[PDB]
Amino acid sequence: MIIYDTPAGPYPARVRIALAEKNMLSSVQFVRINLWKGEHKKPEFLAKNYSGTVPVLELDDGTLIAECTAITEYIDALDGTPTLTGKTPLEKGVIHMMNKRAELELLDPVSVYFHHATPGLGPEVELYQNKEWGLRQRDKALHGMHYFDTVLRERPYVAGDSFSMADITVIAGLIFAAIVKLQVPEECEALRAWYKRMQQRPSVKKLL
């Protein structure tokens, strides 16, 4: 398997964490895409991924699987025992809900804030920027932190009693938040504690 990514990207982190979690890092050849050079916006990479983002998985037969959620679903089901994406119908549903909600309310908006209301990847890569939109996404992400704090006052992991794809998305959300110095509010005690715990997981600790 090939993963096209940048090693320190927060979305890439979602797949790298999931790979470690599945003891599969050794099954993967990582190929560097230089986002700083806008390599992801040029025809060669766009042929690997219409949406122009990393990571993207390429299988031995050339099948391309793009999107963190889809890659995770692929690698989680491979060894026949899913430990990230759910076994029962309720688990699959709640994990996908929380995974998507973490994208919507935390990770995606931090990333839109990076690209739109900061220099981001630089003026040659960020050809269009909407600062007003980017700033509102910053605020959305802050609300997201408060939302995930309320979740974590009631359960030990984002989707319930077990570690899942959803924790990985929030972790990636907080990694991005650190990149842009969007501070987790002091009063977000449950989110802070959970994150410290997450940073103790081998998969996460090695990466950071």
Add this chain to the structure above:
Amino acid sequence: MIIYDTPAGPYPARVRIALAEKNMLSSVQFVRINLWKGEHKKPEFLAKNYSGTVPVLELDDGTLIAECTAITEYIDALDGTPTLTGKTPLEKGVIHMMNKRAELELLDPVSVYFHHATPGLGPEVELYQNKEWGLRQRDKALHGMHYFDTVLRERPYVAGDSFSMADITVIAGLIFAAIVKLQVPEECEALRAWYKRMQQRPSVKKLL
């Protein structure tokens, strides 16, 4: 099971189609949320869904499953034989990729265009609007149509040889597109043909 939705909403259509597809419509009590009155933005509905959108599934024990993808994953796995979200690892991966890509490149941007660069749900509901962002999402959606046309010149359904959650997302994308009169380009022959076929499916035909 309860679904909170509005009957003619394109995102709601994704779940209603999936329910029909799984022969499960009779297992569902539909409860009306009035988006035109901004009911989805008030405290009572926000307690059902932090993200403030429809549809949302509520189980007999009060468990809430939000997000079209998550609801579909839940109901597809219920009867033990998934026909929408994939059996093999490759199927799960490709279907999730295409499902997410249809959201990203077609349905979501049409919807953002509706809410931001048209009157949308009206000036009392659409309290903030970014017309410039909304118009760029319109353009993104147009590109999406061209993208899905290229996919459908090579395979009969969005994710491959079989009907899946991914077709449902594109269908919902085109339903929304019709609402806002964003015309499918003439040269998008494969997308047009596929859509006519989709409108022949009982699940889709009844809904429209």
